[PDB]
Structure 1
């Protein structure tokens, strides 16, 4: 009861009523999912947690599906002010609900527990996204020409699809398989902002599919019941949603690297063998296969050899490499959890009184929605992604079932008789092969002699027919077809800037 005045006299009244507006929105929204049920307005009842706050922020700020107000974000002068308004009001809503969190303490509502640093990470995430879209604002933002206009991802990425690295490395990168394992680790650190150790710890068994999403690539990284602490929960959840660009897609890169790793060239690149998966145990084989390998078959390749790799590549594309900023940890990272809320909040039956459960929409398969789309370099502003029907020429499965057909055998094998992770990984691989054949014609369009095309079954005119399908206007068009990057569209969809990316035969 001592908390009266210093709560009250903490603020300007103007501040207090802006905060009152914001928590009034919060209360109405919790009644909109009847969390507080239906003026019915107590204080020792209203739950405050970082995910609750966060999902309120989702449902109000970012959820611009909203067809009455759909396309303010398209106009540059509207969005350039609108997102600044978003982030300012974001910070104010954070302060408001922090104030309300302290308010529930003086009423003694134990249901209010903040963990601001999670919401600080939300703040930092949206801050970095708006600063990314802000630094990209103009060709002549300042007197720069092409290096503001040089994404360190794509200039590397596209130039890694070349079957030759002649000035670069005959010492290192003869094989395209080594180029693809480099591109795999680079798109790891690109999409999944991690450390070298965190890049090391990917078995195949921690690579799952979207439950409510079909497209999520779940790396359900959990502390294994012992760091100093049992009850294993430190949950780090990640995703590799594909890219409309067929050359920075993680799924395309992954399917390509695993094709060369498993099958490769039938003469030259004799693969590592498509795995057993028959008397596999859940945890036996997929929990042994590294996502990438060198000479060893189980562990992860050598650290300073990767340092050499990144050094050679960033001197090839002439970019400032700094080793801490890829091998050591950043803080621009993914959400982190307990066991407590993770089991508690994602259980629907504890919240089954509600009209909706947040696992459905704003948490696509236990992922905070902006931590999905920002890390996958997307404007996070629909909550209702329906871009999946955008598919000129969906590829035929008869071409698909040529490579990796053992998967098709395994589901015509005793599908029960295989381990649970195994067939789930098999369906993962089929989605990978689908995305692979989908993105294949531009790979043929730009490097027709990759080691994938050291296989004349692809040289047959069924694949070439599908190549002429997807690359149909490519010879006649001045510009490209596929998407680029949210602030690099009007530069590199031009074929010429796209060819300035190439150094060896544009």
Structure 2
């Protein structure tokens, strides 16, 4: 702006210049989009700019400081500008983070919690595979979305929204409500995938296993107002905090990894987070740029694979159906693998899975070659009847 130039006299020459140039860059880029003052600065455009440029992406900070300046150095609300600052700093934490460290805690756990026979475990809970899976989903979930526990219990799965876009090749489970997040299937590593986890767990929870464990029935998805992502004693409520708090060290112990409760029960700040915002498109999903989602779920975005087998119901309320079809595709896609690793798993005990066909497809082509998951398997402390 004409009246903008004078406000950089007021700055040290060098950091007035650096800004001048950042600006030229940003608006000379902005000539690249359809579209006269403050509107030019919106989180959307600044974030797009920063992430879309490697040169900038590697060293975002001077840029961010420039932007917070130009912003507050224009007429923009104080609380507002500071929320912008919040988003930017979040973005940098996101870009700079190396998951390569934390990852093996995920791996090391997920596997062991899938393993149907845990001998070294004399601890009371975790008798079934549904207990193991319940915990594992809570863990994989925090790990991927980095969310508060309390908030974890706030989310009603009727709130959840399936994302299926085959135009851009995306699929996942989104929540645009109070906690803001997006989950995506890892087809490269089903075990460390929270959605596959949720699929098995949900089959066990709902269908149940005939003659062993009562399913809850698929009927209650109507009569109930709040369907919790994982159920405690009561159908309609998330398990209590101290309960999980017991379940956790129990597993970390057996896995021999150090345990800090604050990490899993509260937001972890050294860790990346989704922004907050008060149905998708090419570059974003719910409110969120895709690089957030691919980074935090640590998997490339892929279209939902079409399966011809239905383990989940094809008759439901329209709201939940899409969700359950996603679950169906992940489950059915990755099940032959689970069968080749842990054929002793509770899921396989259902007479349904015993049919001549379901046996047919469990024993058919493998979703990926065995030699892929070796390293993963090397991470469990009870070797099964099948050693490879």
Whole-Å separation in 1 of the counterparts to 2:369 and 2:85: 50
Counterpart residue number, 1:237: 180
- On the 8 A contact 1:216/1:365 being kept in 2, the answer is no
Whole-Å separation in 2 of the counterparts to 1:377 and 1:324: 23
Counterpart residue number, 1:11: 12
* 1:296-445 correspondence to structure 2 within 5 Å: 296-331=234-269, 332-338=272-278, 360-378=281-299, 385=301, 387-388=302-303, 395=307, 397=308, 399-400=309-310, 403-405=311-313, 408-410=314-316, 422-445=317-340
- On the 8 A contact 1:165/1:173 being kept in 2, the answer is no
Normalization by structure 1: what TM-score?
0.67
- The correspondence for 2:171, drawn from 194, 199, 215, is 215
- On the 8 A contact 1:211/1:365 being kept in 2, the answer is no
What SS does the corresponding residue of 1:254 show, helix, strand or coil? helix
- On the 8 A contact 1:208/1:217 being kept in 2, the answer is yes
Whole-Å separation in 1 of the counterparts to 2:192 and 2:322: 22
Q: How far did 1:206 drift?
A: 1.2
Whole-Å separation in 2 of the counterparts to 1:24 and 1:151: 44
Specify whether residues 21 and 324 from structure 1 end up closer, same or farther in structure 2 by C-alpha distance, changes over 3 A only: same
**Residue 18 of structure 2 is aligned to residue 51 of structure 1:** no
Count matched residues: 375
What SS does the corresponding residue of 1:306 show, helix, strand or coil? helix
- On the 8 A contact 2:111/2:376 being kept in 1, the answer is no
RMSD: 3.1
Residues 357-387 of structure 1, C-alpha deviations (whole Å, 9 max, x = no match): xx633222321323212211247xxxxx5x4
Whole-Å separation in 1 of the counterparts to 2:53 and 2:156: 37
- On the 8 A contact 1:263/1:273 being kept in 2, the answer is yes
Q: How far did 1:305 drift?
A: 1.6
Specify whether residues 125 and 163 from structure 1 end up closer, same or farther in structure 2 by C-alpha distance, changes over 3 A only: same
Whole-Å separation in 1 of the counterparts to 2:151 and 2:77: 39
Q: How far did 1:119 drift?
A: 1.1
- On the 8 A contact 1:252/1:436 being kept in 2, the answer is yes
Counterpart residue number, 2:92: 123
Q: Which runs of 5+ in 2 are unaligned?
A: none
Q: Which runs of 5+ in 1 are unaligned?
A: 37-43, 63-81, 137-147, 223-235, 339-345, 347-358, 380-384, 411-421, 481-492
Counterpart residue number, 1:165: 118
Counterpart residue number, 2:68: 98
Whole-Å separation in 1 of the counterparts to 2:376 and 2:93: 31
Q: How far did 1:264 drift?
A: 1.8
Residues 77-121 of structure 1, C-alpha deviations (whole Å, 9 max, x = no match): xxxxx8xx7321x2232233234325544xx999x9562111111
Indicate the structure with greater helix content: 2
* 1:199-210 correspondence to structure 2 within 5 Å: 199-210=152-163
- On the 8 A contact 2:284/2:290 being kept in 1, the answer is yes
- The structure with more radius of gyration: 1
Whole-Å separation in 1 of the counterparts to 2:113 and 2:318: 31
Q: How far did 1:6 drift?
A: 6.8
What SS does the corresponding residue of 2:158 show, helix, strand or coil? helix
Normalization by structure 2: what TM-score?
0.85
Whole-Å separation in 2 of the counterparts to 1:260 and 1:299: 17
Whole-Å separation in 2 of the counterparts to 1:474 and 1:460: 25
Whole-Å separation in 1 of the counterparts to 2:91 and 2:10: 29
- On the 8 A contact 2:206/2:218 being kept in 1, the answer is yes
